[PDB]
Amino acid sequence: DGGRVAQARALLQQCLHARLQVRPADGDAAAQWVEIRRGLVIYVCFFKGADTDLLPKMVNTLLNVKLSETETGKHVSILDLPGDVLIIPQATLGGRVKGRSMQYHSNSGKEEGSELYSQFVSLCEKAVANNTKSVEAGVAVAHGTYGNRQVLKLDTNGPYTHLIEF
Amino acid sequence: AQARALLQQCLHARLQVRPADGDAAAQWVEIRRGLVIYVCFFKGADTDLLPKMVNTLLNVKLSETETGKHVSILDLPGDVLIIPQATLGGRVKGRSMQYHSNSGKEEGSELYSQFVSLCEKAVANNTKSVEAGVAVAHGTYGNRQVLKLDTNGPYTHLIEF
């Protein structure tokens, strides 16, 4: 691969339930939240200098990878389970250790990463909306607010965590 | 490649360490404010590099203080929860995963135990950790890792060895 530099990183966990803060408390206004039920949590990090075709490859790969356990114990995709999807921006996955600190030099800048993040979210939403099984079961796609603290509670039957690099 | 570790910051975590057996309820461990270390060991991993691996993970600055600066889990100080997680070594192959480079049961189990033991020893040799009564807890190798996790931002990092 000649040292071809990575383009993104995604971490995938299975959940029974997730609750994610989408706005922090602000004075008299309480923090605001989104939840999902049984489903897939995708944590995403984008790197500088990636191909124009990265996002549809990521959507296709991640929604179709067979990581969700059926009632028989067989592994299917989130689209086939079917289940919810929660997307969490997680640029820290790009951090590389230097002494006792992390460096994030390969990470997309705030504007680039924000844009890629909104786009990724929207493509996932559409892909789920194109999927018959998902639509008919009423599954939902939820997502974290870019730039915020990802206050997350997660309930699992084994997160079954995988990492996929683009 | 020796190993992969995934690190997440928590306020609380609860991990099933024995499944329910008939009448016998599931058994569990917990930590409070702490670090969750998910670990995967590859085939051929050198046991003599495990102390350094422990050293790297317990001393990396990922835990937030009230002033917003970061310190290791030993300086925070907080708890440590170690979760076996060889799925982290999976490589995507179309719609499936391949785990070819992961240690087998015999080798994996042994590395895991040794790592756990070295983490315990490292915390017990840390003055600040001992003064505060922080605990190291660990999952059961090869069981289903039933986990509840409560975070103020998991702040998830990945470190390769």
Author numbering:
A (entry chain A): 3 to 168
B (entry chain B): 8 to 168
Task: Quote the paper.
Present in kingdom Animalia and more specifically all across phylum Chordata, ATD proofreads a critical tRNA selection error made by AlaRS. This “gain of function” through relaxation of substrate chiral specificity underlies ATD’s unique capability of correcting the error in tRNA selection.
Structural superposition of MmATD on PfDTD and NTD from Pyrococcus abyssi (PabNTD) showed an r.m.s.d. of 1.68 Å over 141 Cα atoms and 3.34 Å over 77 Cα atoms, respectively. As is the case with DTD and NTD, ATD too is a homodimeric protein. The crystal structure of ATD revealed that its characteristic motifs (–PQATL– and –TNGPYTH–) are present at the dimeric interface like the corresponding active site motifs of DTD (–SQFTL– and –NXGPVT–). In contrast, the interaction of MmATD’s Arg151 side chain with the main chain of Gly-transPro motif from the dimeric counterpart pulls the motif’s backbone outwards, thus holding the motif rigidly in trans conformation. Comparative analysis of active sites of DTD and ATD further revealed that the inward flip of ATD’s carbonyl oxygens due to trans conformation of its Gly-Pro motif has created “additional” space in its active site when compared to DTD.
